[PDB]
From a paper:
Dihydroxypropanesulfonate (DHPS), a globally abundant organosulfur compound, serves as an ecologically important currency for nutrient and energy transfer from phytoplankton to bacteria in the ocean. A novel chiral-selective DHPS catabolic pathway was identified in marine Roseobacteraceae strains, where HpsO and HpsP dehydrogenases at the gateway to DHPS catabolism act specifically on R-DHPS and S-DHPS, respectively. R-DHPS is also a substrate for the dehydrogenase HpsN. All three dehydrogenases generate stable hydrogen bonds between the chirality-center hydroxyls of DHPS and highly conserved residues, and HpsP also form coordinate–covalent bonds between the chirality-center hydroxyls and Zn2+, which determines the mechanistic basis of strict stereoselectivity.
The crystal structure of DsHpsP showed that four monomers, each containing two Zn2+ ions, constituted a tetramer in the asymmetric unit. Loop 1 and loop 2 exhibited a rather constricted channel in the ligand-free state, but displayed an “open” state, with movement apart, upon binding of NAD+ and S-DHPS, suggesting a gating function for these loops in ligand entry. In the “open” state, the C3-OH of S-DHPS formed hydrogen-bonding interactions with His59, Glu60 and Glu139, as well as coordinate bonds with Zn2+. ICP-MS analysis revealed the presence of Zn2+ and Mn2+ in the protein. Moreover, the essential residues His59, Glu60, and Glu139 of DsHpsP from D. shibae DFL 12 were conserved in RpHpsP.
Author numbering:
A (entry chain D): -9 to -8, -6 to 327
B (entry chain A): -10 to -8, -6 to 327
């Protein structure tokens, strides 16, 4: 088998200062004991990358490689040339959270792009075998790199549905036209809730999404005063929490994924007098990641185009375009 | 030959006439509608919603109003004359989607006794539908059976919460509040198989009263500071209690919110998110929960249910004064019409 016994450099987009991304040479990673070297084909930009880029992220400082939405090809060893998409969350397998099958809550949970783990905004990453899912030949690595953002919302929806105190699952309202919102919308339709409305103020993304949206797309005003069995706040501001509160039917589900900001917004009185199940969600179980990949690859989660690509060398420029709010697509995929 | 009230004069009721004004006066006897019973009230508990209305804080409860919704008593007239009953005060339609779903506590046209248009049970008599009445066996005092409604509130929350949890880890529970809603949560948790229950109450007089018959741990907030529990129950429902329940809930655990203190913040939203806490606000009880509560009360699964002191209805105004002045060691006063 071909090996990397000696290494040189690889290209990476490194976060060097607030709103500053430099495309430069960094050392190629050394795989640990039971780890594979992944040549990154596609790595998507996430709300956590944006948050760390604007200097808002407390835990992600200094020089740092961001990005945790990676798909690519194993280099060297008996799985050389194998096409895989990466689960970036590494879990201890032995804490109470893991043993009940809620590894998303592991006490020592690490993600790629979260020190001490470098991010996937680079030509190569080192990853344990158990964090890799094989991508069939008929699925582009560019669609497979959506595994992680889809898996966040898939986890929310599965856990939410299973947590509901009744079987009345007719209506869902997803708040936010970002990647989280779309993932929630397509997860809700794949998991058997057909009547899904996504609500988004931005006319541009409404048109983008309406291309191949199997679910209803609307503006806040077209759903004013309506109530739904299920609400998904994919944005997570006070305003969006307030909106989700008002739009959840009595006995209904309010899923809170987005991490916008604020410590309020929930109508405590409505949630008590109308008995609303409110569930905050974090990432996904390893089994959710695998289920998500399975549902993508067999076509249950729609066309998965809601993407535009850019070279890693143009990463910085791509961040500016999201900031200025001029990306019609809800996801930018970088190409090392 | 069944006894009847074909003619009626007045009865005694304790009437909310204005802010902090309770007037023990003559009011009309209620005339039961078609499929309803007249109940002569033996025992009626004072709730937080009564004190809220008495202080002028309730927009839905102005004018002259008879408060109270925690009643037990005797059927008067007809074939059930003399039957001891405890009253489910929440009247539900039985045919709306919530009712058909089995969640009749969320009935779209739900009415509760003490919320207009339905007069409360702070009176010698109430009129209630037969489906809202649970028979009390002679070995259960009406003073203990009048706890059914406040115990059904927490029993319902506990059952809903346990059923809704995302994992089968129910080892430990914190109850915040040594009021009736808190004591009811602690006993309901133990009867539903969470053995390890800690109730937290800052007031020493209340803790001491609760220690008479506590099968759960009674403690100060400081004695549990920094600990996390599978299950937290906010039986108070201020911002401070919502914060304390947020902090004390373990990742993936359950935070039940029952209290109606006030405020619309306190919940640590970013921890509920990052640590995936299931947060459930709860309202009253299903008709089935109320029946289930009564059954467990009557067979002794919910402890001695002796955590009450009683006052004649004629002294209701003094009783309200005592509660307001933090003068009441017991977590429940039962008024005696
Ligand atoms: Zn992501
Ligand atoms: Zn673990
Ligand atoms: Zn009550
Ligand atoms: Zn109904
Ligand atoms: Zn007194």
């Amino acid at each position: 088998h071909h090996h990397h016994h000696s290494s040189g450099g690889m290209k990476a987009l490194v976060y060097t200062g607030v709103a500053q991304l430099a495309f430069r040479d960094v050392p190629e990673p050394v795989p640990a004991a039971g780890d594979h070297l992944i040549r990154i084909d596609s790595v998507g930009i996430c709300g956590s990358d944006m948050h760390a880029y604007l200097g808002h992220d407390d835990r992600r400082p200094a020089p740092l490689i961001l990005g945790h939405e990676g798909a690519g090809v194993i280099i060297g060893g008996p799985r050389d040339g194998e096409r895989v998409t990466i689960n970036p969350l590494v879990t201890c397998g032995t804490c109470p959270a893991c043993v009940s099958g809620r590894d998303n809550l592991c006490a020592t949970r690490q993600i790629i792009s979260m020190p001490p783990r470098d991010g996937a905004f680079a030509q190569y990453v080192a990853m344990p075998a158990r964090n890799l899912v094989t991508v069939p030949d008929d699925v582009p690595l560019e669609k497979a790199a959506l595994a992680e953002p889809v898996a966040v919302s898939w986890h929310a929806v599965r856990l939410g549905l299973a947590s509901m105190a009744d079987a009345r699952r007719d209506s869902a309202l997803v708040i936010g036209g970002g990647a989280i919102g779309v993932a929630a919308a397509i997860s809700l339709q794949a998991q058997g809730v057909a009547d899904v409305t996504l609500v988004e103020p931005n006319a541009m993304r409404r048109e983008y999404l309406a291309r191949d949206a199997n679910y209803t797309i609307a503006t806040p005003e077209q759903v004013a005063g309506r109530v739904f069995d299920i609400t998904v706040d994919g944005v997570g501001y006070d305003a969006t929490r307030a909106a989700a509160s008002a739009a959840t039917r009595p006995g209904g589900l309010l899923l809170h994924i987005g991490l916008g900001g604020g410590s309020a917004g929930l109508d405590i009185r409505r949630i008590t007098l109308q008995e609303i199940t409110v569930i905050g969600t974090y990432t996904y179980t390893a089994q959710d990641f695998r289920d998500t990949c399975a549902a993508m690859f067999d076509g249950r989660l729609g066309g998965l185009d809601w993407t535009e690509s850019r070279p890693l060398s143009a990463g910085a420029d791509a961040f500016a375009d999201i900031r200025a709010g001029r990306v019609p697509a809800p996801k930018i995929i970088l190409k090392p």
